[PDB]
Design a protein around this ligand. Structure first.
Ligand code: HEM
Ligand code: HEM
Lengths: 132, 132
């Protein structure tokens, strides 16, 4: 998918309200936003800071990609998410987020972009796990 | 991401024409739909049939997931696609797809959906490839 700048949405009259009322949470460096389990469910967006999305297995970590400011992710991918800096997120449950999306579909490309990014990573990862 | 039913859109007045003008092509069981080094850019949607998506290196094919009636995909994922049965597709180029998307945002959910499954499939592939 194309790149996506979240600001073309937030600066626009359709977008500016998108996160109104989303709760705010701060994540200490080193802290786990998500474990591959029952964190809960919900979507969040990185306000500032930086998070690492990775997998394990054989007790070994594979980095997939990083989530910096403006990036959207969820609590249910089954990936691990840990803060590498103190980072702030806005969050809401799946349902509120769905609502907002249908009222401002242009903001759906951000979701498209983050899946594209996480997809290309995994694929490149897979190529590399084979070249040995 | 949420599951997507393309009929919801195609039956909507909003989206009934979405594939107007797309061209039709028939691939016979066994034929390659995508290479890596083909360098043609485009989107297609499966009308009927079944395609397999996989990657290759070191002469080891690895299957990721499959595409069936209603699923969308592209010619630039670097992924390799072969028809496991007689499969009819509709296609156009990225530009034309974009336009149709601008005009009918609800259809982007099918993009979110296919990127979505691709993601989950590649992850287990990784989870798998490691207990190995
Ligand atoms: C329909 C299913 C699609 C899939 C599975 C997909 C997947 C991908 C992947 C894996 C890449 C990584 C490029 C690489 O391997 O080097 C990519 C790049 C790209 N794709 Fe898509 N894509 C899809 C649809 C689209 C659409 C609809 C558009 C445009 C409207 C698009 C435009 C682009 C662009 C511009 C890039 C390069 C992004 C960059 O600058 O890094 N793709 N896509
Ligand atoms: C924002 C980035 C997101 C990513 C990377 C993502 C990824 C995933 C993954 C990997 C799964 C399967 C988990 C498993 O392996 O069991 C899943 C399931 C699911 N997610 Fe998401 N998701 C995202 C956002 C969303 C959003 C915005 C919604 C809104 C409805 C949503 C709703 C669902 C639903 C309903 C399922 C299970 C239903 C099905 O079988 O497709 N997710 N998602």
């Amino acid at each position: 998918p194309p790149r996506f700048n979240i600001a073309n949405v937030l600066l626009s009259p359709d977008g500016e309200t998108f996160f109104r009322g989303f709760r705010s949470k701060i994540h200490a460096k080193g802290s786990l936003v998500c474990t591959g389990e029952g964190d809960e469910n919900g979507v969040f967006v990185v306000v500032d800071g930086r998070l690492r999305v990775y997998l394990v297995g054989e007790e070994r970590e594979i980095s997939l990609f990083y989530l910096t400011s403006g990036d959207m992710f969820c609590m249910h991918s089954g990936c691990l998410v840990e803060a590498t800096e103190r980072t702030e997120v806005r969050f809401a449950d799946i349902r509120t987020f769905e609502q907002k999306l249908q009222t401002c579909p242009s903001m759906a490309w951000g979701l498209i972009a983050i899946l594209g990014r996480a997809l290309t990573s995994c694929m490149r990862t897979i190529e590399d796990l084979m070249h040995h």
